[PDB]
Amino acid sequence: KDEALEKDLNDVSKEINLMLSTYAKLLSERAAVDASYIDEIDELFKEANAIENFLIQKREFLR
Amino acid sequence: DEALEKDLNDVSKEINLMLSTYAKLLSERAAVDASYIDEIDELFKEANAIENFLIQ
Amino acid sequence: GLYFSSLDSSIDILQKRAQELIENINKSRQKDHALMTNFRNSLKTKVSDLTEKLEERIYQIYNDHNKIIQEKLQEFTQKMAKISHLETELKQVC
Amino acid sequence: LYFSSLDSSIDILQKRAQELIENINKSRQKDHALMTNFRNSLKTKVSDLTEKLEERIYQIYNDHNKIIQEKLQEFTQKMAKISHLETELKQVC
């Protein structure tokens, strides 16, 4: 009766929470991958910047 | 990112509320059907009263 | 000479890392775009299944309602036939 | 005389039974219509919620792509600046 309806409502709520939480995990992992790519771009830029500093000081010494 | 968390939780909230509202609707309609069962019971009472008077 | 070749090798390593990173980003995007559609499939199907189970339990309730209603209707019909026969007896006797 | 009074009672009971069964039928039809439309509008609402989720996730991905493109362009310009500087040094040395 109504009791069975309430208990299966509990199962329904549990299942919906499970799916939304799994989706949240999916999105968190994807966002982590994107953030890692961004950090790699930043590191590449820093390497370039160091090389540029080296060339700038060599050029100033040559002049 | 913050809004994504808020809206994911809110979506789960809305779906659970909507499914429980559906369950309540279902119970109310079944209750109406049971009320008709009790109306049949009233007809049975009238039949038995007529039968009792006819016996004596 | 050696310094220029070393610095050229460093610059190229940077170029190849950038190229590799763009390729990785693109492949990841194709993958993630498949994943999102998979989620929209599963969400609608599961919500339909849960509504299904709710309706199933209701169908059990209504089946019990029909069983009880049919039993009471059959007994009521018996009551009507019994009262009709008793009344026919009393009519004819009087 | 009495028998006819109880006869009217019998007529009313049987006819009430028929009318009650018909009422149960109409009630079943009403319940079915309510069930189907509530289920449909529920699924439509769920579709709207999925739609808004996809909208926000798309905005997040679009901002990510904007940031990636900006940083890649900035890196490409830094690389070009280094290439030009090194060509200058090649000329000098």
UniProtKB/Swiss-Prot annotation, chain A:
Report whether Iron shows up as a keyword of the record.
Answer: no
One GO BP annotation is: synaptonemal complex assembly
Q: What's a GO cellular component annotated to this UniProt protein? A: central element
Q: Where in the cell is it found?
A: Chromosome
Primary localization class, coarse: nucleus
Keywords, ordered alphabetically: Chromosome, Meiosis
Q: Does the keyword Signal apply?
A: no
Q: In which tissues is it expressed?
A: Testis specific.
Instruction: Fill in the subunit field for this protein.
Output: Interacts with SYCE2.
> What is the annotated role of this protein in its UniProt record?
Component of the transverse central element of synaptonemal complexes (SCS), formed between homologous chromosomes during meiotic prophase. Requires SYCP1 in order to be incorporated into the central element.
Name by which UniProt lists this protein: Testis-expressed protein 12
Organism per entry: Homo sapiens (Human)
User: Which lineage do the record's taxonomy fields give for this organism?
Assistant: Eukaryota, Metazoa, Chordata, Craniata, Vertebrata
From Swiss-Prot, chain C:
Which cellular components does GO assign to this protein? central element; chromosome; nucleoplasm
Query: A GO term (biological process) for this protein?
Result: synaptonemal complex assembly
- Tell where it localizes: Nucleus; Chromosome
Asked if Cell cycle is a keyword of the record, the answer is: yes
Domain of life assignment: Eukaryota
Keyword annotations for this protein, in alphabetical order, are: Cell cycle, Cell division, Chromosome, Coiled coil, Meiosis, Nucleus
User: Where do the coiled-coil regions begin and end?
Assistant: 5-31
Instruction: Describe its function.
Output: Major component of the transverse central element of synaptonemal complexes (SCS), formed between homologous chromosomes during meiotic prophase. Requires SYCP1 in order to be incorporated into the central element. May have a role in the synaptonemal complex assembly, stabilization and recombination.
Tell me the subunit arrangement.
Homodimer. Found in a complex with SYCP1 and SYCE1. Interacts with SYCP1, SYCE1 and SYCE3. Interacts with TEX12.
What the record says about family reads: Belongs to the SYCE family.
Supply the name of the protein: Synaptonemal complex central element protein 2
Which species is listed as the source? Homo sapiens (Human)
Underlying gene: SYCE2
Q: What part of the full protein is here?
A: 57 to 150 of 218
